Amino acid sequence: GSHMAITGTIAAIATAIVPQQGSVGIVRVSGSQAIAIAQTLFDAPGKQVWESHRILYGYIRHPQTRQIVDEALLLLMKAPRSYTREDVVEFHCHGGIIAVQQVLQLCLESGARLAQPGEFTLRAFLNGRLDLTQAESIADLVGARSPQAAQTALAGLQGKLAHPIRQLRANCLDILAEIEARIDFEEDLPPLDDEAIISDIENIAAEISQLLATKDKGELLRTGLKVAIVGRPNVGKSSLLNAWSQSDRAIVTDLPGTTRDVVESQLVVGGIPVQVLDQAANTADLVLLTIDAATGWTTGDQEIYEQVKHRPLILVMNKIDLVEKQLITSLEYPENITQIVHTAAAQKQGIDSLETAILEIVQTGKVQAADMDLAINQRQAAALTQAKMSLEQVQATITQQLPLDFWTIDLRGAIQALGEITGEEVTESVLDRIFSRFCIGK
Amino acid sequence: GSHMAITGTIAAIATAIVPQQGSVGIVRVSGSQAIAIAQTLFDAPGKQVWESHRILYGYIRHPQTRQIVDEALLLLMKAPRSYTREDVVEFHCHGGIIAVQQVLQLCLESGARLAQPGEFTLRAFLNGRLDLTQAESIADLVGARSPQAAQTALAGLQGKLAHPIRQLRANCLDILAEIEARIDFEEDLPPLDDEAIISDIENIAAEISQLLATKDKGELLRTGLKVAIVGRPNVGKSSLLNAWSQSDRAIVTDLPGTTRDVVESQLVVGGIPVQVLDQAANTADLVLLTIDAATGWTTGDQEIYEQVKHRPLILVMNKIDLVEKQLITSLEYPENITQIVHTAAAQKQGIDSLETAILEIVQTGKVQAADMDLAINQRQAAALTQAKMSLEQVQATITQQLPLDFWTIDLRGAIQALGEITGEEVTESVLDRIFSRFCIGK
Ligand SMILES: Nc1nc(=O)c2c([nH]1)NC[C@@H](CNc1ccc(C(=O)N[C@@H](CCC(=O)O)C(=O)O)cc1)N2C=O
Ligand SMILES: Nc1nc(=O)c2c([nH]1)NC[C@@H](CNc1ccc(C(=O)N[C@@H](CCC(=O)O)C(=O)O)cc1)N2C=O
Ligand SMILES: Nc1nc2c(ncn2[C@@H]2O[C@H](COP(=O)(O)OP(=O)(O)O)[C@@H](O)[C@H]2O)c(=O)[nH]1
Ligand SMILES: Nc1nc2c(ncn2[C@@H]2O[C@H](COP(=O)(O)OP(=O)(O)O)[C@@H](O)[C@H]2O)c(=O)[nH]1
Ligand SMILES: [Zn+2]
Ligand SMILES: [Zn+2]
Ligand SMILES: [Zn+2]
Ligand SMILES: [Zn+2]
């Protein structure tokens, strides 16, 4: 019953862990029992100094014996100078699938409880090292699948999003203290400037409208695009992948945990993470239909076009190295298509045009409303519009000139809604949900 | 052309890395350029001390700009007090699939070269911090898929295997200096005790024979068993897995990188890692044939038995909760089977008997010749027998009583063969092959 209050000492595995990959694996412990557990588990030879921000060498051993568990490194982060602001220790094990398990188990046995998803980064927020926008954005950092998705996440982490919103809430709180002091103290204050505070709302709701503009970029860099490739057999679907993948793959270096099929399908086009799925995919945001220009449009092309035409579509005209130049514009295709691209897959050319076509079909809303790499998410934008509505709800009731009693209801609503975002005023259901979608160890 | 000589400064990703899992990911740099690269890349606020074994907080930034790449922790390991004995730095990034890539790239740009498989742990050996048996066993540690496979690997790491072999090589070198001084200095030394040194060989070849006994345990804990489950549809194959898996799974806690299907199939029986494959599997060491005791043996049972009978086989008689007690011994099955087990899969009982049957079918050679958790591998055992052969080759030529000239050839061979194991005398082809089967970052 009810988190929001730090009571125990928590431990979890802090790194990805796969059976025969990766040199090292961490186990992180945080809480008032942290150093006590490192104390009773880590054997550090030849009197090394046990201070904060000090690396130690030794052996994690006794499970009630002295039976050595790993040759490990110990990290100490004491004081409020840690991730969670609590005392933090880290065991740096070899870690296949065995050592970390063994060490974690020894932690639970020494009075640590198993941390829940996001619980480390919650305790960070709970001790006022982070606000919600920051907490949220570190999940965005490790969740990023493109260089600019990270850039956007890093901006969130850095506080670039927490600073404006907390600034705006202060403003509403200030023009709330003005109205609330007049309503209570007889004279002792000259009357309100009825149209100066319609100009203050016009300032605030303007800034929060600039933020709500980024919302689209946010959804794209976070979720990315789900792209299906359809076509007939021997048209060049697999050939299309290779060409596109080689110049657009998200993984350019060999990466221990990840399997080649995710390295192959997870790529990036003009900043947007693009994920290639494997007539079936209505789960796709955009579909690439591939026909063979060497034989031109066929009946098999028509039918699978009939299945996918309701979804955003790009016709990929493959094997143009086989048609001669003068006859390219002569090639037949159903007239409703507005996005056609000629590619020579085996020759690895055309993917530059494919990119332009994919970016084009996306920038019909506003992908050219982008300013910098700061972008809010769904939940943040949800609370911002609701703060905007409630804010111009007051922007109406002061032109009607009701008494100060019927101004204060809606202003509070705006302050509370902005309080949701940074987290000075959040329901615990909202709070639990935020951290529940974090992975374990985070 | 030719490793075996440290020239550059190397960098690689030291942890497993999967797209949306694991709180942190390391990038390790080692060499004379290590600290210089941390210098020019890690922004550490408010003058923190830059000493060895010190944890630093800050921001990995400029790619020729100042553009922040991650909020990271820096680890410094200077002097010969490191993994590789060189100067070692570690960047501890957030790491999804983006941050570590970004940081590694910035390392290559600052004069680091990308480390090759095992190259860190080779440089450790190359600077005499480890012998080959130890180097080999750290790959065994992260490669282990059972608690005792780790225990065995840790023994190797600890030096429990390097100590005896280097001891034995010294002995051969000593009884080589005795013979070689007599052959060269006129008198100046009383003649050899011809049957004292047949007793010395009887001591050495005895100890190296005790080691060669473990070879079997070694192969089992390293490779483990590949077990296939065959049967007809609706017999209880999937039901068998669950029951067996729940009390024998190798992963008892939630582990970021690994997928449920590897958590499900990778289990352990009496110490041996057992991997469950998915009429087809001759790639299996042991097969479990499952029939349905409720309907008894069928014709479909017979045919798939005809496919798998040449492989070691255990008949799993499933659904015994449906046959009544007196009629169990009455159930018909082909007479050549010597290993039958009754299981009630849905009721989760029988897996204790299955274990006993699986251990039984394996301990026909010598799995009860085991003493402790020290066990040599294929390559080590290969060089040991060859040292043994060459050692009793001398154990013959001194009973024939040839001159001291025709003793020295074979003794050297034994010393050289034992020199292969710890690594004081290795071909570079052997050396390259050893580290080539390590994963990257290791
Ligand atoms: N090994 C490792 N463990 C982790 O828990 C971890 C990494 N690496 N890499 C990134 C880091 C997240 N970043 C942080 C954030 C704050 C502090 C910290 O000590 N708190 C102080 C700063 C110290 C100072 O100013 O001197 C603070 O008050 O913010 C440390 C690391 N992180 C988690 O993913
Ligand atoms: N973060 C991290 N990085 C690593 O490279 C690493 C881990 N963890 N965990 C286990 C460790 C392998 N173990 C070692 C071995 C030797 C030293 C070392 O500093 N060498 C000295 C010991 C220092 C002393 O005696 O005070 C030596 O001479 O052996 C450090 C870690 N290892 C890699 O997988
Ligand atoms: N000339 C030419 N041949 C191609 C091109 N793309 C694919 N092919 C050939 O067409 C065959 C079928 O391609 P494939 O990728 O397997 O099509 P899929 O079955 O839809 O995956 C392959 O043998 C390729 O060599 C192209 O752009 N030009
Ligand atoms: N009474 C009984 N029923 C079982 C047992 N094992 C499996 N079943 C039932 O038999 C059905 C088929 O089992 P299943 O695991 O799917 O067999 P598979 O098709 O070979 O994978 C399931 O619906 C189970 O409920 C058992 O030990 N006892
Ligand atoms: Zn194909
Ligand atoms: Zn036509
Ligand atoms: Zn089945
Ligand atoms: Zn019969």
Residue numbers in the entry:
A (entry chain A), B (entry chain A): -2 to 275, 296 to 459
Question: What's written in the study?
Answer:
MnmE is an evolutionary conserved G protein found in bacteria, fungi, and humans, which together with the protein GidA catalyzes the formation of a carboxymethylaminomethyl-group (cmnm) at the 5 position of the wobble uridine (U34) of tRNAs reading 2-fold degenerated codons ending with A or G, i.e., tRNAArg(UCU), tRNAGln(UUG), tRNAGlu(UUC), tRNALeu(UAA), and tRNALys(UUU). The crystal structure of MnmE from Thermotoga maritima reveals a three-domain protein consisting of an N-terminal tetrahydrofolate-binding domain, a central helical domain, and a canonical Ras-like G domain inserted into the helical domain. On the basis of the common feature that the G domain cycle is regulated by homodimerization, MnmE has been categorized as G protein activated by nucleotide-dependent dimerization (GAD), together with the signal recognition particle (SRP) and its receptor (SR), the regulator of Ni insertion into hydrogenases HypB, the dynamins, the human guanylate binding protein hGBP1, the chloroplast import receptors Toc33/34, the septins, and the Roc-COR tandem found to be mutated in Parkinson disease. The X-ray structures show MnmE to be a constitutive homodimer where the highly mobile G domains face each other in various orientations but are not in close contact as suggested by the GDP-AlFx structure of the isolated domains.
NoMnmE crystals with sufficient diffraction were obtained in a PEG 550 monomethyl ether (MME) condition. CtMnmE·GDP and NoMnmE·GDP (grown in presence of AlFx) crystallized in the space groups I4(1)22 and P4(3)2(1)2, respectively, each with one full length protomer in the asymmetric unit. In both cases homodimers are formed via crystallographic symmetry by means of the N-terminal domains. Strikingly, two molecules of 5-formyl-tetrahydrofolate (5-F-THF) were identified in the structure of NoMnmE·GDP, which were apparently copurified from the bacterial expression system. This suggests a high affinity for 5-F-THF and supports the recently proposed enzymatic mechanism whereby the C1 group of the cmnm modification is donated by THF. In NoMnmE·GDP, two Zn2+ atoms from the crystallisation condition, localized by their anomalous signal, are coordinated to the G domain. One of these is coordinated to helix Gα4 and is involved in crystal contacts (see below), the other occupies the usual Mg2+-binding site at the β-phosphate of GDP. As Switch I is resolved, but does not contact the bound GDP and since there is no indication for a physiological role of Zn2+, we consider this to be a crystallographic artefact also observed in the nucleotide binding pockets of other small G proteins. In NoMnmE·GDP a Zn2+-ion tightly links the G domain to symmetry mates, while in CtMnmE·GDP the G domains fix each other by a toothing upside-down arrangement.
